[PDB]
Amino acid sequence: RLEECNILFELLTEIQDEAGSMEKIVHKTLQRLSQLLAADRCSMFICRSRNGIPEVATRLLNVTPTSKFEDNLVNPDKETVFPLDIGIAGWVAHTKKFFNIPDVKKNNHFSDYLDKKTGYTTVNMMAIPITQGKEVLAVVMALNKLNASEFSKEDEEVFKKYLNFISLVLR
Amino acid sequence: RLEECNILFELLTEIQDEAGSMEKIVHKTLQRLSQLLAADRCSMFICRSRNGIPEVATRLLNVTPTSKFEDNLVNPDKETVFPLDIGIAGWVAHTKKFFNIPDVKKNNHFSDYLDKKTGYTTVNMMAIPITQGKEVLAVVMALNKLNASEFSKEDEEVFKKYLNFISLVLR
Amino acid sequence: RLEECNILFELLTEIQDEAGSMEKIVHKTLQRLSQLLAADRCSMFICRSRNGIPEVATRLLNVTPTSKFEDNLVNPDKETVFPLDIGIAGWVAHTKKFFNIPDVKKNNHFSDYLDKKTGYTTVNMMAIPITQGKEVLAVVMALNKLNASEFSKEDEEVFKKYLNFISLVLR
Amino acid sequence: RLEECNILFELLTEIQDEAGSMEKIVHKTLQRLSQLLAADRCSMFICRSRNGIPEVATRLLNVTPTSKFEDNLVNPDKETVFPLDIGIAGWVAHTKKFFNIPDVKKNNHFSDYLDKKTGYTTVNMMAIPITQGKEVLAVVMALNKLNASEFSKEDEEVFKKYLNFISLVLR
Ligand SMILES: Nc1nc2c(ncn2[C@@H]2O[C@@H]3COP(=O)(O)O[C@H]3[C@H]2O)c(=O)[nH]1
Ligand SMILES: Nc1nc2c(ncn2[C@@H]2O[C@@H]3COP(=O)(O)O[C@H]3[C@H]2O)c(=O)[nH]1
Ligand SMILES: Nc1nc2c(ncn2[C@@H]2O[C@@H]3COP(=O)(O)O[C@H]3[C@H]2O)c(=O)[nH]1
Ligand SMILES: Nc1nc2c(ncn2[C@@H]2O[C@@H]3COP(=O)(O)O[C@H]3[C@H]2O)c(=O)[nH]1
């Protein structure tokens, strides 16, 4: 049960081609991250060039300690794409820098396209880019700390800790 | 008990002829427990009394495989003290019982005072009292299992195995 | 395989999204092997070739539970190269065999060149080649058992257990 | 076999009074130290006040990888005592400082009383004091590196490593 995460990871890495969802492993890992962050929700944004122009897209949304994989995975049928100047997820991809944002909308990069479209309200957010040397592969983020006004310094170290592992998984 | 003999012996070759080395030993042991249990951190509360009134106090926090002892040692001036009727730590000291708590939010006894001060989110926990006869010397815990929703039965067995040693050392 | 799942997973959460992380992984694994085997240090020699001529070269030396990666990484300029007909390391690469050497002074193949240069005294050794098909990628060793005259049979089993993982990573 | 050193140490430490030779454990440990140092011989000097005046005395002599305990233990029937100004072992006790001495007799503190009496010739020597806070309990030392002209920097780190453990044993 403790070895689940590895059995699946050793499974996915010995079938050499990554055509078997490393996104299940990211999903499982984003569940645990929520529990120990007490983030209301966690997400992963895929980072791509299409076709010659960099962008951040939606991939995994609304991850909670128990949300089912299918309910979090957004297929290309209906995804939301951002240029890196639009939206605070884009800025992280662009700058390749980590961010603990205690109050969005006091943050100028903040886009509110998805709060309007889905009905959610984003207030807090930690965001961090997964980077394979040159490029950014994805942006992960935790939203809206529970029982508290912002994500703490301690919540940063925990987020960073899991992202070290997620970062390897997307390779 | 092969890898325990090796871990403990090697550990003991890393302890400078100095302090205070008896707590540097407990620390290093805890660092190794973190690895073996995939625990986010381990901690120790000292247990002492004042005129027959016992209490439990922070001593080592945030012990981790890459953590510094002087960073983990609580400064005597700034140590958080609990009476034994407040906290799981205090409860462990009172009852002299081991506990594998899978969700602190569903365990009365849990005190959120340190979480509020430090900013850390505590989810699950193993806790054990270190005793000398009818009196308690410390409470040791492993917080936040990293690769599963809670600490396993098997995890209890490992923790208990390494806490015979800490016990010995804390005398 | 409980404590292996935990050790490896936790280890992987300590690896910064940076290098070169594939060798920081091997390093950290080796640091953990040192603890589990009570080995004074572990090392890795890379194995490469030049026009069909293989050779074996220093890469990670003096890996230890409290050792720094940038101190253990051999500087490409100052790397000691062996042909495979010199050294136990070169012999392991040649034969593609595991060896538990209890006394290097009674094993021809042993080359004392590094001992002379570095000043270190090598006594006993486990050595194993990391392979990809019919070609060798590295040789990993645990030097100088600290709590016994030589590495045990049981020690072979642990080393071999953790070297399936390193193998995986070194691809 | 790897757990021998601990089984004997846990044995000697739970029978609380140290009236059962912690010198067997020091002896066993000084055997391994020789092997991995390639020191010709290792010794321990007990440090005492008799009666009101500090002194360094002989206790364990001529330790080799295989020398039997009885042959190394010098009973008070026939021991050699030094004031701390006489002899390079005394100076270490006095200064409480570590010393790698590449060529005695170029060292002014060097006494040659025992080379004359026993027949041995001391050339090289690493010496280090075991100190319980205030006082020095003993001085351990390695003599005459084999296959080399002095003890290296690497030999220092290994000596220090074992002495951390020996230092705890004498408590
Ligand atoms: N509902 C929902 N919104 C999200 C999630 N992750 C990110 N967002 C929002 O999508 C936005 C993308 O642009 P932003 O300005 O970075 O701010 C981001 C968040 O407000 C999620 O999991 N669920
Ligand atoms: N931040 C932090 N908190 C800890 C650590 N160890 C214990 N605690 C908290 O201290 C609390 C004391 O009360 P509790 O109900 O036992 O729950 C305990 C934990 O929530 C630690 O290492 N770090
Ligand atoms: N100082 C040092 N020497 C090493 C290390 N690993 C291997 N060696 C030495 O490098 C030597 C190469 O030849 P060998 O006969 O295989 O024996 C090997 C060891 O003696 C290490 O980590 N540190
Ligand atoms: N024969 C012998 N001499 C020793 C041993 N250990 C220390 N000595 C010598 O005893 C001497 C004590 O004074 P010194 O000047 O420190 O130098 C020391 C060494 O030369 C040992 O194990 N055997």
UniProtKB/Swiss-Prot annotation, chains A, B, C, D:
Coiled coil: none annotated. 3',5'-cyclic GMP binds at residues 43, 62, 115-118, 122. Disulfide bonds: none annotated. Residues 21-170 form the GAF domain. It is found in: Cell membrane. Belongs to the cyclic nucleotide phosphodiesterase family. As cone-specific cGMP phosphodiesterase, it plays an essential role in light detection and cone phototransduction by rapidly decreasing intracellular levels of cGMP. Composed of two alpha' subunits that are associated with 3 smaller proteins of 11, 13, and 15 kDa. This is Cone cGMP-specific 3',5'-cyclic phosphodiesterase subunit alpha'. It comes from Gallus gallus. The gene is PDE6C. The chain holds residues 55 to 225 of 862 of the full protein.
